[PDB]
Design an enzyme around this catalytic site. Structure first.
Site, PDB file in Angstrom:
ATOM      1  N   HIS A 100       0.824  -1.496  -0.003  1.00 31.08           N
ATOM      2  CA  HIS A 100       0.185   0.080   0.200  1.00 31.08           C
ATOM      3  C   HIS A 100       0.766   1.334   0.053  1.00 31.08           C
ATOM      4  CE1 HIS A 100       0.486   1.379   4.188  1.00 31.08           C
ATOM      5  NE2 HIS A 100       0.037   0.139   4.610  1.00 31.08           N
ATOM      6  N   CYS A 150       4.254   1.651   9.102  1.00 34.29           N
ATOM      7  CA  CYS A 150       4.258   0.307   8.447  1.00 34.29           C
ATOM      8  C   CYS A 150       5.389  -0.249   7.805  1.00 34.29           C
ATOM      9  CB  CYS A 150       3.188   0.752   7.316  1.00 34.29           C
ATOM     10  SG  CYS A 150       1.531   0.909   7.841  1.00 34.29           S
ATOM     11  N   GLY A 180       3.488   6.008   9.997  1.00 35.84           N
ATOM     12  CA  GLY A 180       4.786   5.854   9.758  1.00 35.84           C
ATOM     13  C   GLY A 180       5.402   4.423  10.016  1.00 35.84           C
TER      14      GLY A 180
END
EC number: 3.4.19.12
Lengths: 306, 306
Positions: free
Chosen positions: B41, B145, B143
Site C-alpha cells: 500500500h 508500516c 509511519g
C-alpha cells in the site's frame, strides 16, 4: 495507537558485550574503546565471598589471569585497575563497534533497558525502573553479572547500570558504570535486604495520561484536589510524595490531553480509594509505575534513534 | 530469578531497516541481500485507498518513483515485483549486514518481538503474541508500516510479521514476509473489524509454571481435573480449548516443577472461578497469556544467541 513496555533497540550495546573469565568465575564485560568493564567480584572465589578485601585480591592477580573473549576472538589484557566496585581491564584492541556513549548515574524512578547476557552473548532485552529502594525487578540467572542497563538519546548510549547480585526477595542490585552501588548494598556476602519500597507516583500519573491518549477514559472525573490533599492520600497508600517539580514535568502531557495535572491526581486518588472494580487500564489491572513522563511522550509521539 | 516480558536482541534486524518513499507516502522497508520488502500500500495515494487495484497501480510505476534511503545512502531501485500484499524492490546493492534469516508464517498463540520503526530508524522493541483472532496488540503510529516482527534461533532471524494497518479497536493487522495477511483482513479501506478474541490457554498455563519456578505458589492446590472437565470450564470463560498436544508441549515444565499438567489446569480452573482475591502472580493482577511454553523455558534457563 497502543501502549507497550518498550525497550530501546539493543544493537549498539550488543556489539560491546564480551565474556570475562577469571579462575572459576565467568561473567559479562562491557568493551568500549580499549577497556573492558566488569564487576569486581569476578576476582573473588567461592570461599573469598565471605568478606573479601578486593585491594589485596587484585594485587595478587596478573593480566594473564583475565580471560576475555569477544565472540571467537580472545582479547589480551595489558593492564587492570579498580574503580569502586568495577574492574577496568585494558586490552590491546579497541572495539571497532564502540558507539558514542556516556556513563550516567540515574535517579530512582527513572527507567532503562537491560540487555541480559550470558557468556558474552545477549539473551533478551526488557525495560526496568530503578525502584525507590534502589533495587530493580529484573530477570537474571547465574552468569548474568556484567549485563548493563542503558538509555539511548538520538545516537548516544547512556549506560546507567551494571548487574552484580540478587537479593533474598528476588530483586536485583548493581552499580553505575563507575562502580558505585545503587542503594546501601555492598559486594560482600552478608545479611542484606532490599528495604521498604514505594510506588513511583509521578510515573503512575504519566501512565494515566498514556491511557487517555490511547482512549481509556473511564477513570476520569470532574473533581480536582490540591497538591497537599493529594499527598496526604498518597502517603496512606505507600506512594512517593508528588513534588511541584513532578507537576511541572507532567506539563506537556497535561497540555496534549487537556486534563490538568491536579485533576489527574484527583483521579488517581479515587482509584486508590475505590480500586478499579473489575476494570483495566492499558491492559493492566494494577496501577503501573515503570513508565516515566518521557517514556510516554516518546512512545505516543514516535521518537527514533540512529 | 525474576520474570519479564523479554524481547529478542534487535541488532540483527536494526541493520536491515530502510526508508521507502513513493509519492506522498513514507514507510519502512526490510533490506535483505539485494531486495527491499515493504507493504504494497505504499503505491496507494490518499484517494486510491477506497478500493485499489494494485496490479493496475504497479504497472503504472517506474523504478525511479521508489525512493529508498538506507541511513544517509540512497539506494537505487533496479526492478520491482509484487508477491501478495508485499512489494519486493530490487536494489543494486546487497545489504552487507544481512543476517542469516528465514521467512516463517506463525500460528496464533505464538509470540515474537517487534522492532518499531519510523523513517527507517528503530524506535523501540517489545514482545507481542498473535492473538487467536489474528490481530496483535501493538504500539504503532503513522509511519510505522513495514516494521517487522521476528524470532531468533541461535544465529538465525525468523521474520514472521510486517505491519500494515490499525483496526478500529486499536489493534493491529499485518502480513507474513511473503505478504499473506494474518486473518481475514485486506489492504483496502473498508469496514473491517477484529472479531471475537479468546485467551491463549496453553500460554496461561506456561506462565503459571513460570510463577512456580520463581516462587509464587499461592494458587496451587491438591485437586486435579480431566482434560474434558477442564475444557468445559475454559469455554465458559472464553478460553481456547486445551489439546493433548498442548499438554504434551507443557511436559518439560511439568517435569521441572513436579506439578502435573492436569494439576495446573485444576489451579487455573479455580483462578477462573474465584478470581485472584487481591493477590498477584508475577507482578500481574490478570492471567497473562503472551508467554509460550518455549518463552518460559528460554527465560528460566538462560538460552542466548549469536
Amino acid at each position: 495507537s497502543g501502549f507497550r513496555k518498550m525497550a530501546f533497540p539493543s544493537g549498539k550495546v550488543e556489539g560491546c558485550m564480551v565474556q570475562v573469565t577469571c579462575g572459576t568465575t565467568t561473567l559479562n564485560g562491557l568493551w568500549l574503546d580499549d577497556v573492558v568493564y566488569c564487576p569486581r567480584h569476578v576476582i573473588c572465589t567461592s570461599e573469598d565471598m565471605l568478606n573479601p578485601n578486593y585491594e589485596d585480591l587484585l594485587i595478587r592477580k596478573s593480566n594473564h589471569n583475565f580471560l576475555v573473549q569477544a565472540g571467537n576472538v580472545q582479547l589480551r589484557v595489558i593492564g587492570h585497575s579498580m574503580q569502586n566496585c568495577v574492574l577496568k581491564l585494558k586490552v590491546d584492541t579497541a572495539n571497532p563497534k564502540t558507539p558514542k556513549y556516556k556513563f550516567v548515574r540515574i535517579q530512582p524512578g527513572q527507567t532503562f533497558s537491560v540487555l541480559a547476557c550470558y557468556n558474552g552473548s545477549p539473551s533478551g532485552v526488557y525495560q526496568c525502573a530503578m525502584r525507590p529502594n534502589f533495587t530493580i525487578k529484573g530477570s537474571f540467572l547465574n552468569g548474568s553479572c556484567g549485563s548493563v542497563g542503558f538509555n539511548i538519546d538520538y545516537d548516544c548510549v547512556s549506560f546507567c547500570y551494571m548487574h552484580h547480585m540478587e537479593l533474598p526477595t528476588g530483586v536485583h542490585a548493581g552499580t553505575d558504570l563507575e562502580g558505585n552501588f545503587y542503594g546501601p548494598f555492598v559486594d560482600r556476602q552478608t545479611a542484606q535486604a532490599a528495604g521498604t519500597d514505594t510506588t513511583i507516583t509521578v510515573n503512575v500519573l504519566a501512565w494515566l495520561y498514556a491511557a487517555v491518549i490511547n482512549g481509556d477514559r473511564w477513570f476520569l472525573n470532574r473533581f480536582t484536589t490540591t497538591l497537599n490533599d493529594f499527598n496526604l492520600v498518597a502517603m496512606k497508600y505507600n506512594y512517593e510524595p508528588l513534588t511541584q517539580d513532578h507537576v511541572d514535568i507532567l506539563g506537556p502531557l497535561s497540555a496534549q490531553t487537556g486534563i490538568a495535572v491536579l485533576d489527574m491526581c484527583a483521579s488517581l486518588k479515587e482509584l486508590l480509594q475505590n480500586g478499579m472494580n473489575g476494570r483495566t487500564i492499558l491492559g493492566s489491572a494494577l496501577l503501573e509505575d515503570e513508565f516515566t513522563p518521557f517514556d510516554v511522550v516518546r512512545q505516543c509521539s514516535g521518537v527514533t534513534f540512529q
